[PDB]
Design a protein around this ligand. Structure first.
Ligand SMILES: [Mg+2]
Ligand SMILES: [Mg+2]
Ligand SMILES: [Mg+2]
Length: 127
RNA sequence: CCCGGGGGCCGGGGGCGAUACUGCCGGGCUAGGGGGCGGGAGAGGCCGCCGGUACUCCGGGGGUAGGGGCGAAAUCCGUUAAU
């Protein structure tokens, strides 16, 4: 008997956030971030930070009764980075090793169908 | 240098001629141009109605305490429940 849930992974260039919830996504069983598992702010987007956060969220979900999960990885969608950051792969790898039953792995980064004006002006981030 | 003769001194007018070229007058054409008909092409324009995701904000439910940012941080957001 497999109780199903969803692992949302937010992999940005500065941090990662793993939220494990029920299959409707309304009930949250666990939620970990890189700042909750890493000493300094410089290591939040580290694959180590994503790996240990995925471990902690997985043990919490297994302890609270979730044994199977789909995976939805994402980055900051719209006027930002349209790809998951550097910790999504490590997070899913730690999820797989934690003993949780994997369903479907999908990218759910929100895509603007046009858009809004992004930051940094018109000369870019360095001029 | 002076004398004598011819030429020019770029022009005006008169007379007699020529009609290729330009102009004028008349007639006729279709080669350029314009006006058409037909089937298509186009982010051409104005006007009206509608949608797509993204986004921000707001209200409620889940769930704690971080989030955001950077080369590193810090200001900043958050325990009136944030991400
Ligand atoms: Mg003489
Ligand atoms: Mg004279
Ligand atoms: Mg003289």
């Amino acid at each position: 008997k497999l109780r199903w849930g969803i692992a949302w992974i937010y992999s940005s260039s500065n941090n990662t956030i793993i939220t494990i919830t029920d299959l409707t996504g309304a009930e949250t069983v666990a939620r970990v971030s890189g700042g909750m598992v890493v000493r300094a702010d410089k290591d939040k987007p580290s694959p180590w930070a994503a790996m240990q956060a995925a471990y902690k969220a997985a043990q919490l979900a297994l302890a609270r009764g979730i044994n199977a999960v789909h995976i939805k990885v994402r980055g900051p969608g719209g006027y930002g980075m349209k790809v998951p950051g550097p910790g999504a792969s490590a997070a899913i790898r730690a999820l797989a090793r934690s003993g949780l039953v994997i369903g479907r792995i999908e990218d759910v980064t929100p895509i603007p169908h046009x858009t809004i004006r992004p930051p940094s002006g018109r000369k870019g981030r360095r001029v």
